Design an enzyme around this catalytic site. Structure first.
Site, PDB file in Angstrom:
ATOM      1  N   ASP A 111      44.543  43.930  41.075  1.00  0.00           N
ATOM      2  CA  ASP A 111      45.876  44.521  40.997  1.00  0.00           C
ATOM      3  C   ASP A 111      46.966  43.465  40.841  1.00  0.00           C
ATOM      4  O   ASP A 111      47.960  43.485  41.573  1.00  0.00           O
ATOM      5  CB  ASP A 111      46.163  45.373  42.237  1.00  0.00           C
ATOM      6  CG  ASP A 111      47.173  46.471  41.965  1.00  0.00           C
ATOM      7  OD1 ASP A 111      47.527  46.674  40.784  1.00  0.00           O
ATOM      8  OD2 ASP A 111      47.613  47.132  42.930  1.00  0.00           O
ATOM      9  N   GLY A 128      63.001  46.905  51.332  1.00  0.00           N
ATOM     10  CA  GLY A 128      62.494  47.755  50.269  1.00  0.00           C
ATOM     11  C   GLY A 128      61.980  49.097  50.749  1.00  0.00           C
ATOM     12  O   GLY A 128      60.778  49.358  50.720  1.00  0.00           O
TER      13      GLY A 128
HETATM   14  C1  LIG Z   1      58.232  43.345  44.897  1.00  0.00           C
HETATM   15  C2  LIG Z   1      58.779  43.311  46.319  1.00  0.00           C
HETATM   16  C3  LIG Z   1      59.015  44.572  47.045  1.00  0.00           C
HETATM   17  O1  LIG Z   1      59.815  45.390  46.620  1.00  0.00           O
HETATM   18  N1  LIG Z   1      58.310  44.763  48.158  1.00  0.00           N
HETATM   19  C4  LIG Z   1      58.184  46.071  48.782  1.00  0.00           C
HETATM   20  C5  LIG Z   1      58.915  45.936  50.111  1.00  0.00           C
HETATM   21  C6  LIG Z   1      58.316  44.807  50.941  1.00  0.00           C
HETATM   22  C7  LIG Z   1      58.330  43.494  50.165  1.00  0.00           C
HETATM   23  N2  LIG Z   1      57.616  42.455  50.948  1.00  0.00           N
HETATM   24  N3  LIG Z   1      56.244  42.716  51.120  1.00  0.00           N
HETATM   25  C8  LIG Z   1      55.694  41.712  51.843  1.00  0.00           C
HETATM   26  C9  LIG Z   1      54.263  41.607  52.240  1.00  0.00           C
HETATM   27  C10 LIG Z   1      53.650  42.665  52.900  1.00  0.00           C
HETATM   28  C11 LIG Z   1      52.313  42.572  53.265  1.00  0.00           C
HETATM   29  C12 LIG Z   1      51.588  41.424  52.969  1.00  0.00           C
HETATM   30  O2  LIG Z   1      50.279  41.337  53.332  1.00  0.00           O
HETATM   31  C13 LIG Z   1      52.200  40.367  52.308  1.00  0.00           C
HETATM   32  C14 LIG Z   1      53.538  40.459  51.940  1.00  0.00           C
HETATM   33  C15 LIG Z   1      56.791  40.751  52.145  1.00  0.00           C
HETATM   34  C16 LIG Z   1      56.933  39.465  52.867  1.00  0.00           C
HETATM   35  N4  LIG Z   1      55.872  38.872  53.467  1.00  0.00           N
HETATM   36  N5  LIG Z   1      58.160  38.899  52.906  1.00  0.00           N
HETATM   37  C17 LIG Z   1      59.226  39.473  52.317  1.00  0.00           C
HETATM   38  N6  LIG Z   1      59.172  40.638  51.646  1.00  0.00           N
HETATM   39  C18 LIG Z   1      58.004  41.314  51.525  1.00  0.00           C
HETATM   40  C19 LIG Z   1      57.609  43.681  48.835  1.00  0.00           C
END
Ligand SMILES: *CCC(=O)N1CCC[C@@H](n2nc(-c3ccc(O)cc3)c3c(N)ncnc32)C1
Length: 272
Positions: free
Chosen positions: A136, A25
């Site tokens: 949030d 992402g």
């Molecule tokens: C709605 C999902 C999305 O588009 N995103 C943005 C890109 C990263 C995606 N993603 N975030 C986490 C994450 C980050 C930080 C914390 O603390 C928890 C979770 C992901 C994890 N752990 N695994 C896969 N994709 C993630 C969310």
């Protein structure tokens, strides 16, 4: 607690023991070269934005505290270099916001029932064991995976934004209103405030209009409509606390019911 990665089995590893498989992402999808496990890694650069780094550190603080809550993304380890901080985490599939866009329609109630149970217990665990409010809750903060797990992720602005409770715009259980708006959006495929052009107009519709409840011609159960009605109570004093919410009939039904969330997730992910 730096330089160890525990994906039971604990491995004394470093940053270059991982293979960067691309950005998701800044969150990297990385592979552990020793075994082959695929993990998610967030990279915090020391020269990054001061406000963004402070929010990343606050999120990791709550995540490390909640190693025993099964509805929160677990962190496997941490690597600190002279220029970066790498946060290894459990690799989830995608967020409910991206699940809705790929479904191109409403999400079934049985999936949202398991989603509801996971989110309230995560929000109840944060207020009870740590005195944490999320502030949030939204579909982009609800992560799913191939194994059918449902977890809450972002705690970057947690305390001790069109989903705001009425008591938060004109002054506890403010995260319950955000969950109700998220459920209506995922259950209908339409954001209740999509016609608004500015953030302030959303806030006026929240205080001036009736709560955006579930429709009655889509087969929604009586327990589902009741739970959304309770979450969307405009006065926070009548909005029930988490203790009463976990006793709702909609909560108790999906605490016991076996719903194949994993296969529904893989079926949606296979579509284009
Ligand atoms: C709605 C999902 C999305 O588009 N995103 C943005 C890109 C990263 C995606 N993603 N975030 C986490 C994450 C980050 C930080 C914390 O603390 C928890 C979770 C992901 C994890 N752990 N695994 C896969 N994709 C993630 C969310």
């Amino acid at each position: 607690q730096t330089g160890y990665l525990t994906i039971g089995q604990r491995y004394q590893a470093e940053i270059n023991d991982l293979e960067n498989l691309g950005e998701m992402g800044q969150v990297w999808k990385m592979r552990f070269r020793k075994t082959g496990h695929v993990i998610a890694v967030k990279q915090m650069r020391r020269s990054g934005n001061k406000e963004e780094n402070k929010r990343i550190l606050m999120d990791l603080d709550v995540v490390l505290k909640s190693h025993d809550c099964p509805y929160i993304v677990q962190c496997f380890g941490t690597f600190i270099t002279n220029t970066d901080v790498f946060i290894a985490m459990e690799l989830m599939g995608t967020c409910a916001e991206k699940l809705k866009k790929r479904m191109q329609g409403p999400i079934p109630e049985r999936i949202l029932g398991k989603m509801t149970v996971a989110i309230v217990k995560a929000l109840y665990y944060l207020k009870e064991k740590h005195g944490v409010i999320h502030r949030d809750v939204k579909p982009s903060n609800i992560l799913l995976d191939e194994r059918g797990q449902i977890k809450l992720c972002d705690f970057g602005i947690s305390g001790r934004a069109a989903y705001m409770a009425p008591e938060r715009i004109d002054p506890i259980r403010a995260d319950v209103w955000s969950l109700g708006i998220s459920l209506v959006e995922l259950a209908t495929g339409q954001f209740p405030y999509k016609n608004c052009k500015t953030d302030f107009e959303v806030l006026t519709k929240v205080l001036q209009e009736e709560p955006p409840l579930l429709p009655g011609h889509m087969g929604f159960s009586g327990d589902f409509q009741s739970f959304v009605k309770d979450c969307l109570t405009k006065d926070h004093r009548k909005r029930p606390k988490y203790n009463k919410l976990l006793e709702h009939s909609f909560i108790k039904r999906y605490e016991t019911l076996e719903v194949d969330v994993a296969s529904w997730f893989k079926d949606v992910m296979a579509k284009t």
